[PDB]
Write an enzyme that holds these catalytic residues in place. Structure first.
Site, PDB file in Angstrom:
ATOM      1  N   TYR A  38      51.881  37.119  33.274  1.00  0.00           N
ATOM      2  CA  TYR A  38      51.565  36.749  34.677  1.00  0.00           C
ATOM      3  C   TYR A  38      52.933  37.251  35.485  1.00  0.00           C
ATOM      4  CZ  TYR A  38      48.226  34.074  32.748  1.00  0.00           C
ATOM      5  OH  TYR A  38      47.124  33.345  31.984  1.00  0.00           O
ATOM      6  N   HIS A  40      49.144  38.670  36.996  1.00  0.00           N
ATOM      7  CA  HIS A  40      48.287  39.643  36.694  1.00  0.00           C
ATOM      8  C   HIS A  40      46.962  40.116  37.665  1.00  0.00           C
ATOM      9  CE1 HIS A  40      44.669  38.137  34.700  1.00  0.00           C
ATOM     10  NE2 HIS A  40      45.585  37.410  33.984  1.00  0.00           N
ATOM     11  N   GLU A  58      46.752  36.645  40.078  1.00  0.00           N
ATOM     12  CA  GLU A  58      46.603  35.171  39.652  1.00  0.00           C
ATOM     13  C   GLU A  58      48.060  34.984  39.121  1.00  0.00           C
ATOM     14  OE1 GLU A  58      45.059  34.096  35.919  1.00  0.00           O
ATOM     15  OE2 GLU A  58      43.485  35.899  36.062  1.00  0.00           O
ATOM     16  N   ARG A  77      45.241  28.024  38.317  1.00  0.00           N
ATOM     17  CA  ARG A  77      45.898  29.645  38.730  1.00  0.00           C
ATOM     18  C   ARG A  77      45.932  29.588  40.264  1.00  0.00           C
ATOM     19  NH1 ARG A  77      46.543  29.180  34.219  1.00  0.00           N
ATOM     20  NH2 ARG A  77      45.483  30.638  32.572  1.00  0.00           N
ATOM     21  N   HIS A  92      40.256  27.159  35.163  1.00  0.00           N
ATOM     22  CA  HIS A  92      39.346  27.603  33.986  1.00  0.00           C
ATOM     23  C   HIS A  92      38.667  25.985  33.608  1.00  0.00           C
ATOM     24  CE1 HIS A  92      40.716  31.476  33.078  1.00  0.00           C
ATOM     25  NE2 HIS A  92      41.975  31.142  32.669  1.00  0.00           N
ATOM     26  N   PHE A 100      35.961  31.045  35.834  1.00  0.00           N
ATOM     27  CA  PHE A 100      36.595  30.125  36.706  1.00  0.00           C
ATOM     28  C   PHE A 100      35.683  29.302  37.432  1.00  0.00           C
ATOM     29  CE2 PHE A 100      39.985  33.194  35.942  1.00  0.00           C
ATOM     30  CZ  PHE A 100      41.029  32.470  35.861  1.00  0.00           C
TER      31      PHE A 100
END
Ligand SMILES: Nc1ncnc2c1ncn2[C@@H]1O[C@H](CO)[C@@H](O)[C@H]1OP(=O)(O)O
Ligand SMILES: [Ca+2]
EC number: 4.6.1.24
Length: 104
Positions: A38, A40, A58, A77, A92, A100
């Protein structure tokens, strides 16, 4: 009251700003943290109504208020674009698999 609610997690605008600043800096530096690397790239295949243009990235936002440093990223996120503009807050939690849903 929560500015953003992700499943059972509560975030204020300040939490979001803090997380985005951190993730954006890594992006500028061409750096990542964690096994999942991350921040990414994020692809909006679910067609969320983002008001800013892509590309999108994110970065994990933690329930604890701490900035993500490479361990478990949890399910939430922050999504930002190439210009450091907030696209949205997603999770998520409550979505199947790695998909998501938007935080409310
Ligand atoms: N808490 C979580 N719940 C569901 N999927 C998750 C998750 N943490 C990571 N993933 C997803 O697991 C895969 C490998 O780690 C990636 O698709 C990652 O998606 P993400 O990076 O977009 O969150
Ligand atoms: Ca907080």
């Amino acid at each position: 009251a929560c500015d953003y609610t992700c499943g059972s997690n509560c975030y204020s605008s300040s939490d979001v700003s803090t997380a985005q600043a951190a993730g954006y800096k890594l992006h500028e530096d061409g750096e990542t943290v964690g096994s999942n690397s991350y921040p990414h790239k994020y692809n909006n295949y679910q067609g969320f109504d983002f008001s800013v243009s892509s590309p999108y990235y994110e970065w994990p936002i933690l329930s604890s208020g701490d900035v993500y440093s490479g361990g478990s990223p949890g399910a939430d996120r922050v999504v930002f674009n190439e210009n450091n503009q907030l696209a949205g807050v997603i999770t998520h939690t409550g979505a199947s698999g790695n998909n998501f849903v938007e935080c409310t």
